[PDB]
Amino acid sequence: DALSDGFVRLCIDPSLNFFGEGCKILVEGQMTDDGSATPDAVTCVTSELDIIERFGQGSVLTESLRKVFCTCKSGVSVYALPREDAAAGVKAVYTLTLYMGEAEYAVATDIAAAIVAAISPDFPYAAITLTARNAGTIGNHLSVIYTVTFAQTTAGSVNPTPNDYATVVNECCFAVYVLSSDDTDWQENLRDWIRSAWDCSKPQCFGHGYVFNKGTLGQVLADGDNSAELSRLALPTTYPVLPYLTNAAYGALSACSTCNNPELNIQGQTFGLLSCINMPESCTPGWTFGEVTQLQANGFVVSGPSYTSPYIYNDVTNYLRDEKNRPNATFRDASSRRLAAATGVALAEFLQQFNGLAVFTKNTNIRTGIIGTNPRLMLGKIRKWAQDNVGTLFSEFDNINEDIQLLTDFEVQPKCVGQPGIFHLNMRYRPPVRGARINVNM
Amino acid sequence: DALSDGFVRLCIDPSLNFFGEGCKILVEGQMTDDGSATPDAVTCVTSELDIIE
Amino acid sequence: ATGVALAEFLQQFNGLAVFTKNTNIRTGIIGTNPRLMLGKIRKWAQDNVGTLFSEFDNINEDIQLLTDFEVQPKCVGQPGIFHLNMRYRPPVRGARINVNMAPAL
Amino acid sequence: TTYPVLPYLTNAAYGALSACSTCNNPELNIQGQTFGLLSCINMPESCTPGWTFGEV
Amino acid sequence: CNKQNGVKNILITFTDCDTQEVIGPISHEQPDDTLPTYKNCAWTNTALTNGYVQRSASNATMTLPVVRDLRVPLAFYQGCAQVDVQVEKFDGTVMTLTEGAVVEPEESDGRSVTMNIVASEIDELLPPGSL
Amino acid sequence: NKQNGVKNILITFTDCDTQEVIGPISHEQPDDTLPTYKNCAWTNTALTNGYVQRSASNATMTLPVVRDLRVPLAFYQGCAQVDVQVEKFDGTVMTLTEGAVVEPEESDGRSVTMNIVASEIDELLPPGSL
Amino acid sequence: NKQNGVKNILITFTDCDTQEVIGPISHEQPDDTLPTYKNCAWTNTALTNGYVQRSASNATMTLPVVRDLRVPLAFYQGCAQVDVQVEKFDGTVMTLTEGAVVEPEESDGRSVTMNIVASEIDELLPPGSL
Amino acid sequence: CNKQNGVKNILITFTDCDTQEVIGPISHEQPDDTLPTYKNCAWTNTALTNGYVQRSASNATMTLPVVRDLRVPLAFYQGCAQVDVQVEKFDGTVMTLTEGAVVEPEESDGRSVTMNIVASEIDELLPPGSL
């Protein structure tokens, strides 16, 4: 065609992401043998396409990915970590003599035949006798209500405990971890790995994991601990929706909402609205008011209804105590972790100008013409950088002359123990103050 | 992570006292038998959580 | 680089008249003696701080110049041979920073 | 042991980059994403950089 | 080693305005016995009737005479580039300045240049012991 | 070379009326005042909150020289364009072309101070730069 | 506090085409001139023998500010609704809502003088009033 | 390079209204210390009673003081031709104007000309980082 003969090359194609990935998320769960994905291998799922063809039909992982793709429409690359049922795993069995899972799963002998012909093919229980499509305790959290008898016959048992996080996911840094199992040991192991990511001895992939704990008030606290690496989501004993679907929706919403805005608290009927999850209309919001308050205190995420989409309160982590000090609300709120990660990466980027820069230590000062420096000037520059970031990264300050210190390795380590070129920066920052209780009196 | 490869090695931690001890105080009194502390032995109390035990 | 730079700087003394323990320089001669050579080398080492060497530790001890007569035994040394001992120290550069953050509220 | 790329290619790239960057600047450490980057050598996407933490 | 007035280190970093090339931080030296002169408070006051004062927004200026480096073009010292200057005094005080601009380029003889540096804010390091 | 001073001053005169070119004739310094320069072709101005207004300006040169008795005095006071070239002792060379004298002063007939203006002044920067 | 001057200036922009809300953002003074006010919502006029004809008017406001480089210049010249709040050094606070720029004068792109017209401007009157 | 108010490049393209010729884009330069001055909002307002404001159709104007180019007839700068001006400030902002016309020519001395350019709309490049 004329006017295109040189000097210009059109490349019309609708598949071009000019931004490029961003805010990766990992989903961990079990897949059935009907799939074609290698277990214990992180893979990237990039569409609401086949999925089933890779991770099986009706597996918990398949539904978790479906809900993640429902909640999140763009701006994230989604990763999956398939798992295989344990050898001794026993499938839980239910019997029906209708609402199941979420809304889109909802629907004598003639009744049963037509019902099975209308049950969704991706439902995680084989059809009236219902049998779990995966082996483990995950199948024990099924509830069927007629919006007919349903009281279960077999209880599943034995859950996988991989403990292969170091080998499987070594250095692919992640932001949000979604685990679709109620096994406390598995959640604790994920906690240990995520904490190991925040290790002073290695480069850090700052991430966060979201887990659920369903049960009565007495036992849900017994599951919790002092670790801030996970956002324990308390779920009442009579929770209708499958817990992993709610957990995955919460994780996906948090990931996509924050991504490049690592300061927004996931709250409110507009910013913490899990639209994909649907529940039957009801009055009792699970936990009682005292139960809600107790869960609020002990670092447990409480959720409530707004078909009604659910809504969460107290978007906090499970951080209640210091080493042994009680008052520590620094890492209580979930956003505090994101602020800490952003501040750390920003400070690391700023400090990059001292690579290979000649440092003239205690003995003398800089001679004319050299491009070196000394600790006092570096401390002053760091102080001014900290000052210039007030209002976006830190609070104003308490005492900047006391909250920032720079020390050479020579004057910290004993005689002949220190080595040249290494410094020690001590800094006590303060997260910016945001909206909070107003305590209106009329 | 990006640019966190050598040089800067982050050590974020909630409890890092940068001053160090200072003006120690001693409290003396009677305790019940439910405690797990050695009687007539001076010990440093970390915080308020474990005093009852 | 420091070795080749020192070799280039020391080239002025090759072929230069040198007056050993015998006596001092007389008027008009273009010679030198070990003390002045050591002083010049010491000042050159001092002037290269920040680009070749470190600041220093104690310059009165890291640089020594010795004639070959006072190193080897009697009737073993040779004229016009010098022994220079210098303890280098590379310039200090950037390294680990070890940032510690203790947030509050 | 499970290194995909042919070892001599990576070795040659490292040596060439080191010599070629230093040349007349015999002070720059060949390190960091800015300076310790072997542009020519490529690898398939992976999550396990060979050696684990202990042997690293 | 207090009780002495003077500067110990002068660090200047040049950033070109059109090429965006960063040079420094290079150490400099005084051209004479006149010390660098500072002004921290970024508000200029004025006199009104009966003790009232009107606060008008202004700049934290800094007058800095230095000997130019022979490796840097003279135009960089007269307003064709940004400067990130930082000065350390003998008593431990450090003045840190970023994103500064030379406002009134005075004709220089080619060795000594007097800078009239204007920036948003100047930070004082205030040697230990404060308030 | 640690020696501040000028070593050669070359001036070329181009009469603005007859278009006759004379030079480049070496010149002589009249006193201890050195030629003074300003290379940055922009004049800044102080504003508030650290902002600065960049206004286009001209490159100037204050060059005091001893007049040459073979050259009319009018050439040093704005009757001719000047092509000045000054080399310092430390190797630096300032090159100026198509200059003009802006504010002539009342000169005694031996020493003249030239206030020269050009679009841009070149710098030679003796070896070793940036 | 025996000091005259503004401490904080907050402006919130509401586009009239897309109904997009931006801010509030703290701004900076462009020079020594302080913002001026006319809070009393009625304008008088002189009549014969002491009488005054009382007529309706606007609570105007002349606000010179330095434009933010993250906001289009058109938003400062009447292409959007402004909701401006200002606090003086003595604690007085003027609050303005649903204000519009009335006479956009052609500006150089750094400092903008905004002539805001509003229904009414509320005053804080720091502790101790009437 | 930011925090410096000024103009870096001025590009003008002349389109004669008689011969329909096109010349440019030719770089120009400032005649004095005054900066080019803009008005982007294509609507002008007017004060009314009790807070209301009347919006009426208007134009995006522009005052461009430039030094005339000796290769271009002076009549082009004075309304005998159409101009497509494009000004880039030192902070990265680029104001683009097409299909312009000089409205109120003034007598010029033959070197410095001050345009009063009008157009339907002026586009702002708004350097990276927006809203």
PDB file of C-alpha atoms in Angstrom, chain H:
ATOM      1  CA  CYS H   1      17.345  20.450  35.810  1.00  0.00           C
ATOM      2  CA  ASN H   2      13.925  21.384  37.181  1.00  0.00           C
ATOM      3  CA  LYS H   3      13.142  24.301  39.541  1.00  0.00           C
ATOM      4  CA  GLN H   4      14.317  26.663  36.770  1.00  0.00           C
ATOM      5  CA  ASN H   5      11.635  28.776  35.100  1.00  0.00           C
ATOM      6  CA  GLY H   6      12.476  29.639  31.514  1.00  0.00           C
ATOM      7  CA  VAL H   7      12.240  28.628  27.875  1.00  0.00           C
ATOM      8  CA  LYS H   8      14.650  26.217  26.177  1.00  0.00           C
ATOM      9  CA  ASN H   9      13.447  25.820  22.568  1.00  0.00           C
ATOM     10  CA  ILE H  10      11.044  27.798  20.381  1.00  0.00           C
ATOM     11  CA  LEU H  11       9.977  26.322  17.037  1.00  0.00           C
ATOM     12  CA  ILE H  12       7.882  28.317  14.561  1.00  0.00           C
ATOM     13  CA  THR H  13       6.520  27.136  11.205  1.00  0.00           C
ATOM     14  CA  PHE H  14       5.243  29.807   8.819  1.00  0.00           C
ATOM     15  CA  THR H  15       2.407  28.971   6.414  1.00  0.00           C
ATOM     16  CA  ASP H  16       1.760  31.903   4.088  1.00  0.00           C
ATOM     17  CA  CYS H  17      -1.915  32.626   3.457  1.00  0.00           C
ATOM     18  CA  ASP H  18      -1.305  33.924  -0.093  1.00  0.00           C
ATOM     19  CA  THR H  19       1.158  31.539  -1.770  1.00  0.00           C
ATOM     20  CA  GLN H  20       0.304  28.594   0.542  1.00  0.00           C
ATOM     21  CA  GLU H  21       4.003  27.989   1.183  1.00  0.00           C
ATOM     22  CA  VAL H  22       5.428  26.271   4.265  1.00  0.00           C
ATOM     23  CA  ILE H  23       8.657  27.337   5.985  1.00  0.00           C
ATOM     24  CA  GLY H  24      10.137  25.716   9.071  1.00  0.00           C
ATOM     25  CA  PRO H  25      10.277  24.602  11.705  1.00  0.00           C
ATOM     26  CA  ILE H  26      12.948  27.205  12.505  1.00  0.00           C
ATOM     27  CA  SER H  27      14.399  27.649  15.980  1.00  0.00           C
ATOM     28  CA  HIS H  28      14.193  31.150  17.458  1.00  0.00           C
ATOM     29  CA  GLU H  29      15.492  32.992  20.509  1.00  0.00           C
ATOM     30  CA  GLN H  30      14.355  35.413  23.212  1.00  0.00           C
ATOM     31  CA  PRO H  31      14.894  39.165  22.696  1.00  0.00           C
ATOM     32  CA  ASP H  32      14.884  40.089  26.388  1.00  0.00           C
ATOM     33  CA  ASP H  33      14.258  38.693  29.879  1.00  0.00           C
ATOM     34  CA  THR H  34      10.467  38.410  29.534  1.00  0.00           C
ATOM     35  CA  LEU H  35       9.175  34.865  29.166  1.00  0.00           C
ATOM     36  CA  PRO H  36       6.462  33.664  26.777  1.00  0.00           C
ATOM     37  CA  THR H  37       3.111  33.800  28.520  1.00  0.00           C
ATOM     38  CA  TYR H  38       0.185  31.440  28.011  1.00  0.00           C
ATOM     39  CA  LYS H  39      -3.554  30.992  28.498  1.00  0.00           C
ATOM     40  CA  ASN H  40      -4.820  27.435  28.037  1.00  0.00           C
ATOM     41  CA  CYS H  41      -8.477  27.433  29.134  1.00  0.00           C
ATOM     42  CA  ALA H  42     -10.572  28.132  26.034  1.00  0.00           C
ATOM     43  CA  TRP H  43     -13.395  29.623  28.138  1.00  0.00           C
ATOM     44  CA  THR H  44     -13.494  33.022  29.816  1.00  0.00           C
ATOM     45  CA  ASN H  45     -15.646  33.720  32.861  1.00  0.00           C
ATOM     46  CA  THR H  46     -17.480  36.731  34.262  1.00  0.00           C
ATOM     47  CA  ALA H  47     -18.636  37.641  37.757  1.00  0.00           C
ATOM     48  CA  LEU H  48     -22.346  37.432  38.550  1.00  0.00           C
ATOM     49  CA  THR H  49     -24.597  37.983  41.571  1.00  0.00           C
ATOM     50  CA  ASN H  50     -24.236  35.708  44.615  1.00  0.00           C
ATOM     51  CA  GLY H  51     -21.363  33.430  43.661  1.00  0.00           C
ATOM     52  CA  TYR H  52     -22.576  32.499  40.178  1.00  0.00           C
ATOM     53  CA  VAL H  53     -20.211  32.746  37.210  1.00  0.00           C
ATOM     54  CA  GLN H  54     -21.026  33.183  33.515  1.00  0.00           C
ATOM     55  CA  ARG H  55     -19.000  31.035  31.110  1.00  0.00           C
ATOM     56  CA  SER H  56     -18.566  32.301  27.550  1.00  0.00           C
ATOM     57  CA  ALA H  57     -16.615  31.056  24.556  1.00  0.00           C
ATOM     58  CA  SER H  58     -13.043  32.334  24.324  1.00  0.00           C
ATOM     59  CA  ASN H  59      -9.655  31.387  22.888  1.00  0.00           C
ATOM     60  CA  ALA H  60      -6.274  30.050  23.955  1.00  0.00           C
ATOM     61  CA  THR H  61      -3.977  33.056  23.563  1.00  0.00           C
ATOM     62  CA  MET H  62      -0.192  33.307  23.579  1.00  0.00           C
ATOM     63  CA  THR H  63       2.320  36.164  23.794  1.00  0.00           C
ATOM     64  CA  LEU H  64       5.626  35.184  22.175  1.00  0.00           C
ATOM     65  CA  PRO H  65       8.499  37.709  22.250  1.00  0.00           C
ATOM     66  CA  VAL H  66      11.100  36.452  19.765  1.00  0.00           C
ATOM     67  CA  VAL H  67      13.985  37.756  17.686  1.00  0.00           C
ATOM     68  CA  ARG H  68      13.062  37.810  14.010  1.00  0.00           C
ATOM     69  CA  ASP H  69      15.018  35.592  11.634  1.00  0.00           C
ATOM     70  CA  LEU H  70      16.739  37.521   8.848  1.00  0.00           C
ATOM     71  CA  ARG H  71      15.769  34.840   6.300  1.00  0.00           C
ATOM     72  CA  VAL H  72      12.039  35.430   6.924  1.00  0.00           C
ATOM     73  CA  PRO H  73      10.097  38.547   5.840  1.00  0.00           C
ATOM     74  CA  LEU H  74       8.945  40.699   8.740  1.00  0.00           C
ATOM     75  CA  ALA H  75       5.339  40.555   7.500  1.00  0.00           C
ATOM     76  CA  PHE H  76       5.125  36.895   8.556  1.00  0.00           C
ATOM     77  CA  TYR H  77       5.583  37.855  12.221  1.00  0.00           C
ATOM     78  CA  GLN H  78       2.876  40.540  11.937  1.00  0.00           C
ATOM     79  CA  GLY H  79      -0.195  38.587  10.832  1.00  0.00           C
ATOM     80  CA  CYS H  80       0.429  38.000   7.115  1.00  0.00           C
ATOM     81  CA  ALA H  81       1.026  34.276   7.720  1.00  0.00           C
ATOM     82  CA  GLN H  82      -0.125  31.374   9.879  1.00  0.00           C
ATOM     83  CA  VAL H  83       2.185  30.043  12.590  1.00  0.00           C
ATOM     84  CA  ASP H  84       2.483  26.680  14.371  1.00  0.00           C
ATOM     85  CA  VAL H  85       4.535  27.532  17.458  1.00  0.00           C
ATOM     86  CA  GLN H  86       5.978  24.998  19.909  1.00  0.00           C
ATOM     87  CA  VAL H  87       7.689  26.051  23.150  1.00  0.00           C
ATOM     88  CA  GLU H  88       9.594  23.779  25.549  1.00  0.00           C
ATOM     89  CA  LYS H  89      10.400  24.992  29.057  1.00  0.00           C
ATOM     90  CA  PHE H  90      13.351  23.862  31.173  1.00  0.00           C
ATOM     91  CA  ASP H  91      11.089  21.805  33.455  1.00  0.00           C
ATOM     92  CA  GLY H  92      10.021  19.563  30.557  1.00  0.00           C
ATOM     93  CA  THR H  93       6.669  21.164  29.738  1.00  0.00           C
ATOM     94  CA  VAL H  94       5.946  21.475  26.013  1.00  0.00           C
ATOM     95  CA  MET H  95       3.176  23.779  24.784  1.00  0.00           C
ATOM     96  CA  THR H  96       2.050  22.928  21.247  1.00  0.00           C
ATOM     97  CA  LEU H  97      -0.008  25.304  19.108  1.00  0.00           C
ATOM     98  CA  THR H  98      -1.248  24.681  15.568  1.00  0.00           C
ATOM     99  CA  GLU H  99      -3.164  26.818  13.068  1.00  0.00           C
ATOM    100  CA  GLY H 100      -2.360  30.075  14.847  1.00  0.00           C
ATOM    101  CA  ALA H 101      -2.752  33.693  13.791  1.00  0.00           C
ATOM    102  CA  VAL H 102      -1.316  36.977  15.061  1.00  0.00           C
ATOM    103  CA  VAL H 103      -4.139  39.295  16.135  1.00  0.00           C
ATOM    104  CA  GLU H 104      -2.760  42.704  17.206  1.00  0.00           C
ATOM    105  CA  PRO H 105       0.547  43.467  15.471  1.00  0.00           C
ATOM    106  CA  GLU H 106       2.685  46.248  16.900  1.00  0.00           C
ATOM    107  CA  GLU H 107       5.344  48.331  15.191  1.00  0.00           C
ATOM    108  CA  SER H 108       8.674  46.517  15.529  1.00  0.00           C
ATOM    109  CA  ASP H 109      12.184  47.955  15.354  1.00  0.00           C
ATOM    110  CA  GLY H 110      13.288  45.227  12.928  1.00  0.00           C
ATOM    111  CA  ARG H 111      14.929  42.832  15.396  1.00  0.00           C
ATOM    112  CA  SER H 112      12.494  42.050  18.237  1.00  0.00           C
ATOM    113  CA  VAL H 113       8.870  41.101  17.541  1.00  0.00           C
ATOM    114  CA  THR H 114       6.195  40.331  20.147  1.00  0.00           C
ATOM    115  CA  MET H 115       3.483  38.030  18.812  1.00  0.00           C
ATOM    116  CA  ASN H 116      -0.086  37.814  20.098  1.00  0.00           C
ATOM    117  CA  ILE H 117      -1.001  34.343  18.860  1.00  0.00           C
ATOM    118  CA  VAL H 118      -4.509  32.865  19.009  1.00  0.00           C
ATOM    119  CA  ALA H 119      -5.682  29.290  18.479  1.00  0.00           C
ATOM    120  CA  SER H 120      -8.581  26.986  19.275  1.00  0.00           C
ATOM    121  CA  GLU H 121      -6.625  25.038  21.900  1.00  0.00           C
ATOM    122  CA  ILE H 122      -3.116  24.707  23.334  1.00  0.00           C
ATOM    123  CA  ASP H 123      -1.788  21.296  24.384  1.00  0.00           C
ATOM    124  CA  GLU H 124       0.385  20.841  27.479  1.00  0.00           C
ATOM    125  CA  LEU H 125       2.915  18.010  27.631  1.00  0.00           C
ATOM    126  CA  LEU H 126       2.914  18.031  31.457  1.00  0.00           C
ATOM    127  CA  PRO H 127       6.238  16.260  32.211  1.00  0.00           C
ATOM    128  CA  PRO H 128       6.054  12.757  33.693  1.00  0.00           C
ATOM    129  CA  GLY H 129       4.082  12.446  36.907  1.00  0.00           C
ATOM    130  CA  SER H 130       0.490  13.610  36.531  1.00  0.00           C
ATOM    131  CA  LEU H 131      -2.619  13.931  38.712  1.00  0.00           C
TER     132      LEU H 131
END
